[PDB]
Amino acid sequence: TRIGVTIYKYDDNFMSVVRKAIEKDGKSAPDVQLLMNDSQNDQSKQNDQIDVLLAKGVKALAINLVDPAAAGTVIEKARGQNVPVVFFNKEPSRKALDSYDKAYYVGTDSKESGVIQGDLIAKHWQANQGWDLNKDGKIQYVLLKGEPGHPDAEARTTYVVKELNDKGIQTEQLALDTAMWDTAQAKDKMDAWLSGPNANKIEVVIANNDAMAMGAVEALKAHNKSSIPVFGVDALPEALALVKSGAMAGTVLNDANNQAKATFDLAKNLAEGKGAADGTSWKIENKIVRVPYVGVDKDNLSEFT
Numbered sequence: 337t338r339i340g341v342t343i344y345k346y347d348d349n350f351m352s353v354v355r356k357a358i359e360k361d362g363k364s365a366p367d368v369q370l371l372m373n374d375s376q377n378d379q380s381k382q383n384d385q386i387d388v389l390l391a392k393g394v395k396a397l398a399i400n401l402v403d404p405a406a407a408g409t410v411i412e413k414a415r416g417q418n419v420p421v422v423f424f425n426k427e428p429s430r431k432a433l434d435s436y437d438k439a440y441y442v443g444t445d446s447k448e449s450g451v452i453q454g455d456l457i458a459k460h461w462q463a464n465q466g467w468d469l470n471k472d473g474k475i476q477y478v479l480l481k482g483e484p485g486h487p488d489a490e491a492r493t494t495y496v497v498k499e500l501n502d503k504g505i506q507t508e509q510l511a512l513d514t515a516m517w518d519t520a521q522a523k524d525k526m527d528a529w530l531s532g533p534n535a536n537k538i539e540v541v542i543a544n545n546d547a548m549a550m551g552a553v554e555a556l557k558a559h560n561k562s563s564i565p566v567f568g569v570d571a572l573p574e575a576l577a578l579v580k581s582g583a584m585a586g587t588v589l590n591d592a593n594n595q596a597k598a599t600f601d602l603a604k605n606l607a608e609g610k611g612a613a614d615g616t617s618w619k620i621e622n623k624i625v626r627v628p629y630v631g632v633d634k635d636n637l638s639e640f641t
């Protein structure tokens with residue numbers, strides 16, 4: 337069976353571990369041919385790749401959109417040919433999911449990573465009283481946001497502060513800006529914050545993902561401000577190493593392996609005419625499979641590395 341898969345950007349670091357896990361699953365299954373494509377962060381690039389995949393007779397499509405709003409376009413191309421589409425990681429509109437009977441989504445509940453990240457910061461702030469540099473009881477922080485409009489970026493930006501507040505901890509946002517899920521852009525942005533007027537007031541660096549966290553970690557050691565706690569989201573192998581050295585204070589596992597497994601399992605099922613979850617233990621709720629995030633810090637780190 338031929339399954340065509342598009343990854344919105346191959347050098348997105350979390351999409352790179354998903355991509356690779358998708359490939360290992362496809363190679364262990366002797367009756368499947370996966371046709372992998374890098375959309376290069378361009379939705380028209382992706383749109384033309386879905387035409388070639390359909391021209392090639394694929395039986396199911398697993399699509400990681402560059403734009404969440406291109407879902408309708410992708411469904412209309414798949415529909416003419418009655419082909420299943422499993423959208424994964426960037427969530428389409430509920431109404432776009434509902435417009436096609438064979439459209440499914442594999443993701444996470446975005447909200448939950450922001451809540452867990454807020455609980456990590458609350459636990460380590462209570463425990464590390466010296467992180468309150470100006471001794472006022474409030475967290476003065478900077479936030480590195482992902483793509484504006486992206487469901488994960490927006491929920492993680494909102495729910496980390498809501499959770500801290502809910503856990504009794506008042507916050508003061510010194511600065512927030514997007515570095516668009518990227519290491520080098522977050523390095524620049526942190527360097528700039530550390531070269532500006534409130535470099536001395538920054539107590540906590542909160543980032544919506546690990547690639548950006550790692551960028552802030554190297555702007556922060558360049559200014560020898562290696563003592564500022566940095567939190568991220570995803571539990572990338574490289575970030576677990578920093579959590580281990582203490583250069584980062586915590587992460588949230590974004591489970592690349594089971595989301596890649598669920599995408600593979602539903603796309604092959606649907607490609608073979610079976611029910612989306614047949615023979616699987618995936619719980620599909622309203623065409624959606626949501627995999628859980630897990631909080632990770634020095635105390636439960638041995639479960640991850």
Ligand SMILES: OC[C@H]1O[C@@H](O)[C@H](O)[C@@H](O)[C@@H]1O
Pocket residue numbers: 348349350351425426488517544545546569570590
């Ligand atoms: O859409 C891609 C993005 O999805 C998020 O869930 C991850 O945390 C990001 O690091 C990733 O780049």
Ligand SMILES: [Ca+2]
Pocket residue numbers: 468469470471472473474475476539
């Ligand atoms: Ca403070």
